[PDB]
Design an enzyme around this catalytic site. Structure first.
Site, PDB file in Angstrom:
ATOM      1  N   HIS A 178      -3.022  -9.717  -1.302  1.00 61.56           N
ATOM      2  CA  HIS A 178      -3.302  -8.366  -0.822  1.00 61.56           C
ATOM      3  C   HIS A 178      -4.152  -8.341   0.443  1.00 61.56           C
ATOM      4  O   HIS A 178      -3.793  -7.710   1.434  1.00 61.56           O
ATOM      5  CB  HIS A 178      -3.962  -7.517  -1.885  1.00 61.56           C
ATOM      6  CG  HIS A 178      -4.172  -6.103  -1.457  1.00 61.56           C
ATOM      7  ND1 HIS A 178      -3.148  -5.182  -1.413  1.00 61.56           N
ATOM      8  CD2 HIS A 178      -5.280  -5.456  -1.032  1.00 61.56           C
ATOM      9  CE1 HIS A 178      -3.619  -4.024  -0.988  1.00 61.56           C
ATOM     10  NE2 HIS A 178      -4.910  -4.165  -0.749  1.00 61.56           N
ATOM     11  N   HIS A 238      -4.202  -0.611   6.547  1.00 64.66           N
ATOM     12  CA  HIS A 238      -3.132   0.375   6.652  1.00 64.66           C
ATOM     13  C   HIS A 238      -2.555   0.444   8.057  1.00 64.66           C
ATOM     14  O   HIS A 238      -2.814   1.396   8.791  1.00 64.66           O
ATOM     15  CB  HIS A 238      -3.619   1.746   6.212  1.00 64.66           C
ATOM     16  CG  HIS A 238      -4.014   1.811   4.770  1.00 64.66           C
ATOM     17  ND1 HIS A 238      -4.844   2.791   4.267  1.00 64.66           N
ATOM     18  CD2 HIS A 238      -3.692   1.018   3.722  1.00 64.66           C
ATOM     19  CE1 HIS A 238      -5.017   2.600   2.972  1.00 64.66           C
ATOM     20  NE2 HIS A 238      -4.328   1.529   2.618  1.00 64.66           N
ATOM     21  N   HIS A 294     -11.622  -3.366   7.059  1.00 59.07           N
ATOM     22  CA  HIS A 294     -11.522  -4.612   6.293  1.00 59.07           C
ATOM     23  C   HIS A 294     -11.567  -5.869   7.164  1.00 59.07           C
ATOM     24  O   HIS A 294     -11.096  -6.928   6.756  1.00 59.07           O
ATOM     25  CB  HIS A 294     -10.250  -4.630   5.447  1.00 59.07           C
ATOM     26  CG  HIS A 294     -10.060  -3.402   4.624  1.00 59.07           C
ATOM     27  ND1 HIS A 294     -11.044  -2.897   3.804  1.00 59.07           N
ATOM     28  CD2 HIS A 294      -8.997  -2.575   4.493  1.00 59.07           C
ATOM     29  CE1 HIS A 294     -10.594  -1.811   3.200  1.00 59.07           C
ATOM     30  NE2 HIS A 294      -9.354  -1.595   3.600  1.00 59.07           N
ATOM     31  N   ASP A 353       0.823  -1.198   0.000  1.00 59.93           N
ATOM     32  CA  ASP A 353       0.000   0.000   0.000  1.00 59.93           C
ATOM     33  C   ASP A 353       0.867   1.262   0.000  1.00 59.93           C
ATOM     34  O   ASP A 353       0.682   2.153   0.819  1.00 59.93           O
ATOM     35  CB  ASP A 353      -0.911  -0.039   1.228  1.00 59.93           C
ATOM     36  CG  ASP A 353      -1.978  -1.136   1.131  1.00 59.93           C
ATOM     37  OD1 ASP A 353      -3.143  -0.815   0.854  1.00 59.93           O
ATOM     38  OD2 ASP A 353      -1.670  -2.325   1.323  1.00 59.93           O
ATOM     39  N   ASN A 398      -6.574  -4.142  -4.429  1.00 60.26           N
ATOM     40  CA  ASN A 398      -7.872  -3.626  -4.875  1.00 60.26           C
ATOM     41  C   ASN A 398      -7.804  -2.237  -5.556  1.00 60.26           C
ATOM     42  O   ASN A 398      -8.661  -1.894  -6.382  1.00 60.26           O
ATOM     43  CB  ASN A 398      -8.922  -3.676  -3.750  1.00 60.26           C
ATOM     44  CG  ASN A 398      -8.678  -2.631  -2.667  1.00 60.26           C
ATOM     45  OD1 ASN A 398      -7.705  -2.708  -1.911  1.00 60.26           O
ATOM     46  ND2 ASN A 398      -9.571  -1.653  -2.583  1.00 60.26           N
ATOM     47  N   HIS A 399      -6.780  -1.450  -5.240  1.00 60.25           N
ATOM     48  CA  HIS A 399      -6.608  -0.185  -5.946  1.00 60.25           C
ATOM     49  C   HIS A 399      -6.099  -0.375  -7.366  1.00 60.25           C
ATOM     50  O   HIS A 399      -6.010   0.577  -8.133  1.00 60.25           O
ATOM     51  CB  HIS A 399      -5.757   0.801  -5.148  1.00 60.25           C
ATOM     52  CG  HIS A 399      -6.474   1.360  -3.956  1.00 60.25           C
ATOM     53  ND1 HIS A 399      -7.241   2.505  -4.018  1.00 60.25           N
ATOM     54  CD2 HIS A 399      -6.591   0.896  -2.687  1.00 60.25           C
ATOM     55  CE1 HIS A 399      -7.780   2.734  -2.833  1.00 60.25           C
ATOM     56  NE2 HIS A 399      -7.401   1.774  -2.008  1.00 60.25           N
ATOM     57  N   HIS A 453      -3.411  -4.130   2.303  1.00 63.10           N
ATOM     58  CA  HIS A 453      -4.818  -3.755   2.387  1.00 63.10           C
ATOM     59  C   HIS A 453      -5.132  -2.905   3.635  1.00 63.10           C
ATOM     60  O   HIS A 453      -5.455  -1.730   3.505  1.00 63.10           O
ATOM     61  CB  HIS A 453      -5.713  -4.989   2.298  1.00 63.10           C
ATOM     62  CG  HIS A 453      -7.112  -4.693   1.858  1.00 63.10           C
ATOM     63  ND1 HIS A 453      -7.440  -3.591   1.105  1.00 63.10           N
ATOM     64  CD2 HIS A 453      -8.271  -5.362   2.061  1.00 63.10           C
ATOM     65  CE1 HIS A 453      -8.736  -3.597   0.855  1.00 63.10           C
ATOM     66  NE2 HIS A 453      -9.264  -4.661   1.424  1.00 63.10           N
ATOM     67  N   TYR A 509      -2.285   4.387  -5.873  1.00 61.19           N
ATOM     68  CA  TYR A 509      -3.572   4.952  -5.462  1.00 61.19           C
ATOM     69  C   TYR A 509      -4.119   5.975  -6.465  1.00 61.19           C
ATOM     70  O   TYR A 509      -4.886   6.874  -6.119  1.00 61.19           O
ATOM     71  CB  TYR A 509      -3.517   5.509  -4.033  1.00 61.19           C
ATOM     72  CG  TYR A 509      -3.443   4.402  -2.991  1.00 61.19           C
ATOM     73  CD1 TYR A 509      -2.269   3.684  -2.802  1.00 61.19           C
ATOM     74  CD2 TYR A 509      -4.550   4.055  -2.222  1.00 61.19           C
ATOM     75  CE1 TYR A 509      -2.185   2.678  -1.876  1.00 61.19           C
ATOM     76  CE2 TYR A 509      -4.473   3.044  -1.281  1.00 61.19           C
ATOM     77  CZ  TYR A 509      -3.284   2.356  -1.118  1.00 61.19           C
ATOM     78  OH  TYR A 509      -3.171   1.342  -0.196  1.00 61.19           O
TER      79      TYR A 509
HETATM   80  C1  LIG Z   1     -12.493   0.615   1.340  1.00 57.66           C
HETATM   81  C2  LIG Z   1     -11.701   0.630   0.061  1.00 57.66           C
HETATM   82  C3  LIG Z   1     -12.606   0.714  -1.191  1.00 57.66           C
HETATM   83  C4  LIG Z   1     -10.811  -0.546  -0.043  1.00 57.66           C
HETATM   84  C5  LIG Z   1      -9.495  -0.090   0.312  1.00 57.66           C
HETATM   85  C6  LIG Z   1      -8.265  -0.796   0.573  1.00 57.66           C
HETATM   86  C7  LIG Z   1      -7.104  -0.109   0.917  1.00 57.66           C
HETATM   87  C8  LIG Z   1      -7.157   1.287   0.989  1.00 57.66           C
HETATM   88  C9  LIG Z   1      -8.376   1.987   0.737  1.00 57.66           C
HETATM   89  C10 LIG Z   1      -8.495   3.466   0.797  1.00 57.66           C
HETATM   90  O1  LIG Z   1      -9.179   4.065  -0.228  1.00 57.66           O
HETATM   91  C11 LIG Z   1      -9.538   1.271   0.394  1.00 57.66           C
HETATM   92  O2  LIG Z   1     -10.848   1.749   0.090  1.00 57.66           O
HETATM   93 FE   LIG Z   2      -4.751   0.202   0.417  1.00 55.29          FE
HETATM   94 ZN   LIG Z   3      -6.112  -2.561  -0.353  1.00 59.20          ZN
END
Ligand SMILES: CC1(C)Cc2cccc(CO)c2O1
Ligand SMILES: [Fe+3]
Ligand SMILES: [Zn+2]
Ligand SMILES: *[C@@H]1O[C@H](CO)[C@@H](O[C@@H]2O[C@H](CO)[C@@H](O)[C@H](O)[C@H]2NC(C)=O)[C@H](O[C@@H]2O[C@@H](C)[C@@H](O)[C@@H](O)[C@@H]2O)[C@H]1NC(C)=O
Ligand SMILES: *[C@@H]1O[C@H](CO)[C@@H](O[C@@H]2O[C@H](CO)[C@@H](O)[C@H](O)[C@H]2NC(C)=O)[C@H](O[C@@H]2O[C@@H](C)[C@@H](O)[C@@H](O)[C@@H]2O)[C@H]1NC(C)=O
Ligand SMILES: *[C@@H]1O[C@H](CO)[C@@H](O[C@@H]2O[C@H](CO)[C@@H](O)[C@H](O)[C@H]2NC(C)=O)[C@H](O[C@@H]2O[C@@H](C)[C@@H](O)[C@@H](O)[C@@H]2O)[C@H]1NC(C)=O
Ligand SMILES: *[C@@H]1O[C@H](CO)[C@@H](O[C@@H]2O[C@H](CO)[C@@H](O)[C@H](O)[C@H]2NC(C)=O)[C@H](O[C@@H]2O[C@@H](C)[C@@H](O)[C@@H](O)[C@@H]2O)[C@H]1NC(C)=O
Ligand SMILES: *[C@@H]1O[C@H](CO)[C@@H](O[C@@H]2O[C@H](CO)[C@@H](O)[C@H](O)[C@H]2NC(C)=O)[C@H](O[C@@H]2O[C@@H](C)[C@@H](O)[C@@H](O)[C@@H]2O)[C@H]1NC(C)=O
Ligand SMILES: *[C@@H]1O[C@H](CO)[C@@H](O)[C@H](O)[C@H]1NC(C)=O
Ligand SMILES: *[C@@H]1O[C@H](CO)[C@@H](O)[C@H](O)[C@H]1NC(C)=O
Ligand SMILES: *[C@@H]1O[C@H](CO)[C@@H](O)[C@H](O)[C@H]1NC(C)=O
Ligand SMILES: CC1(C)Cc2cccc(CO)c2O1
Ligand SMILES: [Fe+3]
Ligand SMILES: [Zn+2]
Lengths: 426, 426
Positions: free
Chosen positions: A280, A319, A290, A129, A195-196, A317, A161
């Site tokens: 990830h 942070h 998450h 990240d 996911n980004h 994922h 990002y």
């Molecule tokens: C909640 C989501 C769509 C997923 C995700 C994973 C890692 C960092 C972010 C911040 O936008 C993030 O936004």
């Molecule tokens: Fe992230």
């Molecule tokens: Zn992520």
């Protein structure tokens, strides 16, 4: 807020000269270390996709030929993207390579890894990240200044990002390319897709998952008989590294599922005793953010990771930073009540390490109390290092941005699950 | 112990005439029922993709144009495949349609559903894992001989089992197309992708999953803003049907996950009372075969189904019949020990109806004793009917191949979860 580095930042500066190659990066190009994928972007015109290269030793200058590609994304036009694979390299040697042979030329260098072997030491960086905030710059700066001296970065997803910007403004991919160049142009970063990188934006007719990412960053997936760039493995030094995709199918019968099941069967612990998995989304995570997302992949893959005595699984994922105990939670049968993770010396340690900076925000909310299965957790920016000493010992350290480059906030000894399966529990 | 119907079987007879259209099937072609997709194959030459059609009401002959495509699978070459969408159909009326306009014409008819509405009755058939065994043939006849009169088939996946043959002999897709014609040519079948559709076979350089299925069976996916043929919805009569792909990605942020999340937001119980979800692999299953395979998708989607008051979730994959109670298992947090399903009036009934015949092997092994969550399960071949009386009542019944076509072995009233959420427990 907004803590992304301004376009006119020094890390974002453009290499001078007509069609000077920019956003240079390299990664392992084959299954064992003898090859390297070299990549870059030229902005003024297509240019040559040729790489010149030579070891500092035996001085013969050879030339590799590759391909050029372009993509569009909504109102954005990419520059000229080059990937070239330099093959048949000598183990354990410094090589100089050059790109931009037709016009402005730039020179870089890298060091091939030792040949895979049971007792080959090697130091991996661990970064997730990353993003391009000021925090991001601090992390990368720590990593390169580490005395442990990292040789390859294992990168667990979420790169630029750039998808947070208006229309995923892809210029923000270009900047992250030029920012990371000072590291990845000299050492492989092993890429995981986060996911980004999905960039699923139906609202502007961009409906092809992973597009910008897949154009800008090639991996050696055929090397391991995978049919997709999103899951593959490579062997380097004494490590066998399996890279998975939290965002591709993993149902019974899918490609990724089918590939993984075979790949594990191909793992020879006497040749690479360090079995490392990347992905990830974390399967063990006690942060609120998450929380439990990784549950789906866990139902499919956890038991395998245990059957195959995996040493460690790294994730991003979330942070922040977490390190599980060696546990498994694979006895569940719907009606048998067995859904609590238990100590298990065959299971990997799970490490969340998605705190390299992102867009400048840390995940501080945690499930309380700390669960039995969590060994350590802290909401601070930083990166890690997994440092292989030999067939029985890997030293893992976590370094915070607020600390000095030599300080290890968290630091544990990994005892190998195949050659030394003893309680390394902290 | 090979129970597939031989190639010279009557159900596989080739329609006669030069380039006579064969394997004719229809399916809904728009979101709400005003359009219909006509599909067929021609074997002798490309032929025309035109479809002539008129209503009984107006007797005005009209022409619609479609596209022709072809594919290869290993050493198999498809015939000429035609997909044509008829549009601007009038509600609740009989149409005749003709295909093969250049050489041998063939004529069929269908009946558009009523315009969607709160109290609009409709009888859906349920068939899954049909196959082309002698058992397959019996189920299909029981279906068409049913006093209930199914108006549309909800087909939960596993079509031909062509992939059980050497190199997936795609010939066995052609035979299946001809065999199911006597139903699907006259009423739509709504298609769900199963595991036998995956056809991932890298050993023979066939690595694009769902390839054959994809070419032969089209669905109105752009109609619900899906970006893939493997997940989509339609509205028909008083039902809103959602089709999902067990073998596509459903991770958070992936296209299917994104689509489903938005699609549930779009559901209007005041227009379409009955919310129905189709998928191939069951979330609840108490049979040995494939036990717990649906766990991953359940962890992602179950709560959504409870949240949006899904009335019923249909699946196949397991070669038997099963009907759950209204249950949920959505309270688990890794360490709270809450991993047991509980009665939950807000949850759907889960039905397993993958017992239409396959290649003639029933899954008789059940986990003993029957779980609390399981209401009824029997290992017999057969099909289902989901008969909507109005906004509050629907009658579901299961017919066994070994019984008279008019006999129901299981029968149960559904009380709508949005309009009439009374305990409908048996
Ligand atoms: C909640 C989501 C769509 C997923 C995700 C994973 C890692 C960092 C972010 C911040 O936008 C993030 O936004
Ligand atoms: Fe992230
Ligand atoms: Zn992520
Ligand atoms: C980028 O590299 C090109 C290849 O080295 C340069 O062009 C080539 O220069 C040769 C000797 O000057 C000459 O024989 C070729 O015609 C020429 N171009 C091509 C198409 O091969 C190019 O130099 C510029 O463009 C060419 C066409 C000339 O007009 C020069 O005067 C230009 O400076 C290089 N481009 C730049 C902007 O440096
Ligand atoms: C693999 O590397 C480990 C770390 O370098 C070795 O452990 C260390 O051995 C030192 C002397 O070699 C000793 O002073 C240190 O305390 C120790 N460090 C740790 C964390 O244990 C290890 O050496 C072997 O194993 C250790 C436990 C002792 O029994 C040594 O005598 C052994 O040589 C290395 N193992 C192998 C297989 O080389
Ligand atoms: C596609 O390849 C198949 C083999 O990879 C063909 O079948 C094989 O043909 C052999 C000699 O032609 C025969 O002795 C084998 O039994 C058979 N292998 C298998 C597993 O079926 C297949 O062939 C056609 O149909 C077969 C049954 C024979 O009648 C052949 O004469 C036919 O060519 C190939 N299909 C096509 C369209 O090429
Ligand atoms: C399939 O239909 C075609 C017309 O839609 C036929 O081509 C046509 O056949 C008529 C014979 O009665 C002929 O007069 C027309 O000229 C012709 N129309 C065209 C060529 O577009 C076709 O008939 C065959 O092929 C034609 C070209 C001739 O060779 C005839 O002798 C053939 O019967 C029909 N195909 C078959 C095989 O029946
Ligand atoms: C919606 O459909 C239901 C199923 O047909 C209706 O219930 C049935 O109503 C019949 C008389 O209309 C009655 O003889 C049946 O026994 C009954 N069947 C069942 C399974 O309950 C329902 O009818 C309404 O509510 C029922 C319970 C009766 O009390 C009637 O007065 C109502 O018509 C239908 N709903 C409506 C509002 O029409
Ligand atoms: C794309 O669109 C945005 C506004 O939507 C505009 O401000 C920007 O300058 C455009 N970029 C390009 C390269 O067209
Ligand atoms: C990033 O860090 C580098 C190296 O420490 C430093 O020279 C540079 O000024 C920093 N860039 C920004 C914008 O912080
Ligand atoms: C299949 O069933 C149909 C209807 O029951 C019947 O006409 C036909 O004889 C059967 N064919 C085979 C191959 O069983
Ligand atoms: C065990 C497998 C390969 C899975 C599967 C799914 C659906 C049908 C069948 C046939 O037994 C089947 O066998
Ligand atoms: Fe099946
Ligand atoms: Zn199946």
């Amino acid at each position: 807020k907004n803590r992304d580095m301004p376009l006119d930042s020094d890390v974002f500066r453009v290499p001078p000269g007509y069609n000077a190659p920019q956003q240079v990066h390299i990664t392992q190009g084959d299954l064992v270390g003898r090859a390297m994928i070299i990549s870059w972007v030229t902005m003024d015109e297509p240019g040559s996709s040729a790489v010149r290269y030579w070891s500092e030793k035996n001085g013969r200058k050879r030339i590799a030929k590759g391909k050029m590609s372009t993509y569009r994304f909504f109102n954005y036009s990419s520059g000229f993207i080059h990937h070239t694979t330099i093959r048949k390299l000598k183990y354990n040697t410094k090589y100089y390579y050059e790109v931009g042979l037709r016009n402005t030329t730039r020179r870089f260098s890298f060091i091939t890894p030792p040949q895979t072997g049971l007792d080959v030491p090697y130091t991996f960086g661990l970064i997730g990240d990353l993003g391009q905030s000021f925090d991001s710059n601090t992390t990368l700066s720590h990593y390169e200044l580490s005395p442990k001296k990292g040789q390859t970065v294992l990168f667990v997803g979420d790169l630029s990002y750039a998808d947070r910007y208006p229309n995923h403004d892809n210029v923000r991919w270009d900047t992250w390319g030029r920012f990371t160049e000072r590291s990845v142009a000299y050492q492989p970063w092993i890429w995981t897709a986060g996911n980004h990188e999905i960039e699923f934006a139906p609202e502007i007719n961009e409906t092809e998952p992973f597009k910008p990412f897949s154009y800008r960053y090639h991996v050696p997936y055929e090397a391991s008989q995978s049919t997709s760039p999103f899951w593959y493995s490579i062997k380097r030094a004494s490590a066998h590294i399996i890279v998975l995709s939290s965002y591709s199918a993993y149902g019974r019968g899918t490609p990724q599922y089918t590939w993984l099941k075979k790949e594990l069967r191909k793992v020879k612990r006497s040749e690479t005793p360090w079995l490392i998995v990347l992905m990830h989304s974390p399967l063990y995570n006690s942060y609120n953010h998450h929380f439990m997302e990784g549950e789906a992949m866990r139902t499919k893959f956890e038991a395998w990771f245990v059957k195959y005595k995996v040493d460690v699984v790294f994730a991003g994922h979330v942070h922040a930073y977490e390190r599980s105990e060696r546990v498994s939670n694979i006895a569940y049968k719907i009606t048998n009540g067995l859904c609590t993770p238990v100590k298990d010396q065959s299971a990997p340690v799970y490490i969340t390490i998605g705190d390299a900076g992102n867009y400048g925000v840390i995940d501080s909310n945690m499930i309380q109390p700390q669960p039995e299965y969590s060994a350590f957790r802290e909401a601070s920016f930083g990166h890690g290092m997994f440092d292989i000493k030999n067939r029985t010992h890997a030293h893992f350290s976590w370094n915070r941005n607020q600390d000095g480059v030599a300080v290890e906030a968290d630091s544990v000894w990994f005892f190998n699950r195949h050659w030394y399966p003893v309680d390394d529990s902290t």
